[PDB]
Design a protein around this nucleic acid. Structure first.
Length: 131
DNA sequence: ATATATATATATATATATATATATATATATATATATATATATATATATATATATATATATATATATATATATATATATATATATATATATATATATATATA
């Protein structure tokens, strides 16, 4: 019972503003954050290593291909996207569909190189196509 | 008449706390007139070096607190578009049971 009736801009703004004002209270914010601190630490600890490893390995791959500067961000981003999919739905035909869709996305919108996208996918999933 | 605590009249001696008239000496706290030296706290005239707290002119690197231009990922507080489930505080459509005013 959260997204059942349509909300106009005034309703969204009113509720977002009420909640932002409530959270700015010292007691409210301190209580909520001190209560969710251990769970946040646990979620960070279980999830971030999988992505720091991807950062390191895609860096290694990008240095061998001569990519420098902000153009590295492109492929780094691509890598993280693929890793996200692997963390979300697992390996199988769905991951294959998403890898193909992400390659199409990046090649068509950001002018990425298909060879380096294959190289990043090979270092992450084990093969260029990801099977 | 004797012992004690005091004030006197008359000269003198001894010990102590002070003020003088006369010159000199010693130790101490100071202010001066005349040059010079030593240690200490400062302000200067002239160049230079060392350590420290800052502001600059010119490029570059490192750590920290923030704002960006560009796509992406992770944790956190929220508002949405679409259907579904769990826990909690409510109001209803329909009959029924239990506890309470």
């Amino acid at each position: 019972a959260k997204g059942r009736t349509p909300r106009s801009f005034s309703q969204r703004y009113g509720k977002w503003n009420a909640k932002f004002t409530a959270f700015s209270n010292p007691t409210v914010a301190s209580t909520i954050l001190t209560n969710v601190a251990p769970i946040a630490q646990g979620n960070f600890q279980t999830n971030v290593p999988k992505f720091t490893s991807v950062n390191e390995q895609v860096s290694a791959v990008l240095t061998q291909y001569g990519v420098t500067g902000p153009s590295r961000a492109i492929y780094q981003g691509y890598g993280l996207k693929v890793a996200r999919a692997l963390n979300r739905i697992g390996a199988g035909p769905a991951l294959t569909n998403m890898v193909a869709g992400l390659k199409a996305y990046y090649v068509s919108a950001y002018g990425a190189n298909p060879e380096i996208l294959d190289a990043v996918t090979n270092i992450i999933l084990g093969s260029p196509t990801g099977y």
